[PDB]
Design an enzyme around this catalytic site. Structure first.
Site, PDB file in Angstrom:
ATOM      1  CG  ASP A 165     -15.316 -18.105   7.020  1.00  0.00           C
ATOM      2  OD1 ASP A 165     -15.755 -19.062   7.086  1.00  0.00           O
ATOM      3  OD2 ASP A 165     -15.215 -17.297   7.913  1.00  0.00           O
ATOM      4  N   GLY A 182     -21.587 -11.409  18.863  1.00  0.00           N
ATOM      5  CA  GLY A 182     -20.840 -12.701  18.844  1.00  0.00           C
ATOM      6  C   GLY A 182     -19.403 -12.668  18.914  1.00  0.00           C
TER       7      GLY A 182
HETATM    8  C1  LIG Z   1     -22.322  -6.859  11.046  1.00  0.00           C
HETATM    9  C2  LIG Z   1     -23.821  -7.041  11.509  1.00  0.00           C
HETATM   10  C3  LIG Z   1     -24.525  -8.055  12.280  1.00  0.00           C
HETATM   11  C4  LIG Z   1     -25.629  -7.768  12.320  1.00  0.00           C
HETATM   12  N1  LIG Z   1     -26.544  -8.751  12.802  1.00  0.00           N
HETATM   13  C5  LIG Z   1     -26.439  -9.621  13.593  1.00  0.00           C
HETATM   14  N2  LIG Z   1     -25.247 -10.288  13.842  1.00  0.00           N
HETATM   15  C6  LIG Z   1     -25.352 -11.297  14.714  1.00  0.00           C
HETATM   16  O1  LIG Z   1     -24.165 -11.864  14.864  1.00  0.00           O
HETATM   17  C7  LIG Z   1     -22.688 -11.431  14.250  1.00  0.00           C
HETATM   18  C8  LIG Z   1     -21.546 -11.905  15.061  1.00  0.00           C
HETATM   19  C9  LIG Z   1     -22.468 -11.581  12.941  1.00  0.00           C
HETATM   20  N3  LIG Z   1     -22.174 -10.759  12.293  1.00  0.00           N
HETATM   21  C10 LIG Z   1     -22.179 -11.032  10.869  1.00  0.00           C
HETATM   22  C11 LIG Z   1     -22.584 -12.239  10.255  1.00  0.00           C
HETATM   23  F1  LIG Z   1     -22.427 -12.361   9.132  1.00  0.00           F
HETATM   24  C12 LIG Z   1     -23.244 -13.009  11.088  1.00  0.00           C
HETATM   25  N4  LIG Z   1     -23.232 -12.696  12.394  1.00  0.00           N
HETATM   26  C13 LIG Z   1     -26.245 -11.670  15.354  1.00  0.00           C
HETATM   27  F2  LIG Z   1     -26.260 -12.683  16.227  1.00  0.00           F
HETATM   28  C14 LIG Z   1     -27.512 -11.031  15.264  1.00  0.00           C
HETATM   29  N5  LIG Z   1     -28.510 -11.313  15.837  1.00  0.00           N
HETATM   30  C15 LIG Z   1     -29.707 -10.381  16.043  1.00  0.00           C
HETATM   31  C16 LIG Z   1     -30.548 -10.199  17.375  1.00  0.00           C
HETATM   32  O2  LIG Z   1     -30.558 -11.404  17.983  1.00  0.00           O
HETATM   33  C17 LIG Z   1     -29.067 -12.213  17.979  1.00  0.00           C
HETATM   34  C18 LIG Z   1     -28.803 -12.709  16.954  1.00  0.00           C
HETATM   35  N6  LIG Z   1     -27.582 -10.070  14.394  1.00  0.00           N
HETATM   36  N7  LIG Z   1     -26.054  -6.757  11.384  1.00  0.00           N
HETATM   37  N8  LIG Z   1     -24.716  -6.265  10.770  1.00  0.00           N
END
Ligand SMILES: Cc1cc(Nc2nc(O[C@@H](C)c3ncc(F)cn3)c(F)c(N3CCOCC3)n2)[nH]n1
EC number: 2.7.10.2
Length: 275
Positions: A125, A13
């Site tokens: 947030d 992301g």
């Molecule tokens: C810091 C972190 C993020 C993740 N996993 C994750 N993060 C995503 O988005 C990020 C930007 C995120 N970071 C922190 C958050 F609190 C929320 N989102 C996804 F999109 C996604 N996915 C798993 C595999 O398919 C795509 C979605 N999986 N594990 N640890």
């Protein structure tokens, strides 16, 4: 952590990547999440290093775990939670997420906030898009990019922003506290019970109430008047009144009349056990 060992797997992301940390060049090492900065000033960089020290300082079950860091050109490294943001996960898998399940995540988030509270951190947030799903039965607060440390004396802190989650005092005076996190928690609980039906999102509903014709910088002012006149996000479909009441009590214009995360943790669990 050495940055020549982070093998890039996919974009997730400010920017976050899925990587494999593999010093044995074996494809055996573990998959991790790597946060870094898109276009970075020394100001952004100075807040990023605070975030990193806020994350390392936290060791709880419903807070994503700090792994390490690596440079110079800083990257933050954390455990990879494989199901992504609770916000997308709920859109994807509603059929096997029932209300008992919503309340499960809810109480895991309060417990995470309670813990933050005991460190005098203020999240700022809280929204479903910042909650990560580890598996079917566990979620974690997963981003801390706006989190702040309360000053020793004062029990609040002053500062684009997510206005549809903000308490009135944050909108009018930029005051953030445990009470404004609770306001926001109420919105998180609203979100869950809408199942993120896109047109029931807090922005869509508030804009409906303000008038969709309202634009630019006036939105925030009309939002402030709505909240002053006790306008509120409606009860979503199938939300039982007992649960709406928790939201409406979180959304109290009076700051210290808002429940604690202890109150909420316990009140959610008791409700859980009776369905
Ligand atoms: C810091 C972190 C993020 C993740 N996993 C994750 N993060 C995503 O988005 C990020 C930007 C995120 N970071 C922190 C958050 F609190 C929320 N989102 C996804 F999109 C996604 N996915 C798993 C595999 O398919 C795509 C979605 N999986 N594990 N640890």
């Amino acid at each position: 952590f050495e940055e020549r060992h982070l093998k890039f797997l996919q974009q997730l992301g400010g920017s976050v990547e899925m990587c494999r940390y593999d010093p044995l060049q074996d494809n055996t090492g573990e998959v991790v999440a790597v946060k870094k900065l898109q276009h970075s000033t020394e100001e952004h960089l100075r807040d990023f290093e605070r975030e990193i020290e806020i994350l390392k300082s936290l060791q709880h079950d419903n807070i994503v775990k700090y792994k390490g860091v690596c440079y110079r050109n800083l990257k933050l490294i954390m455990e990879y939670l494989p199901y992504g943001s609770l916000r997308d996960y709920l859109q994807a898998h509603a059929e096997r997420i029932d209300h008992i399940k919503l309340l499960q995540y809810t109480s895991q988030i309060c417990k995470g906030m309670e813990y933050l509270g005991t460190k005098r951190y203020i999240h700022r947030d809280l929204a479903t898009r910042n909650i990560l799903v580890e598996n079917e039965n566990r979620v974690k607060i997963g981003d801390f990019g706006l989190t702040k440390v309360l000053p020793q004396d004062k029990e609040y802190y002053k500062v684009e922003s997510p206005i549809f989650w903000y308490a009135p005092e944050s909108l009018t005076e930029s005051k953030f506290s445990v009470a404004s996190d609770v306001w926001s928690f109420g919105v998180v609980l609203y979100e869950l019970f809408t199942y993120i039906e896109k047109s029931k999102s807090p922005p869509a509903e508030f804009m409906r109430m303000i008038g969709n014709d309202k634009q630019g910088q006036m939105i925030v002012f009309h939002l402030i008047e709505l909240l002053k006149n006790n306008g509120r996000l409606p009860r979503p479909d199938g939300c039982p009144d007992e649960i709406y009441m928790i939201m409406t009590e979180c959304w109290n214009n009076n700051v210290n009349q808002r429940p604690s995360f202890r109150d909420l943790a316990l009140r959610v669990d008791q409700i859980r056990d009776q369905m």
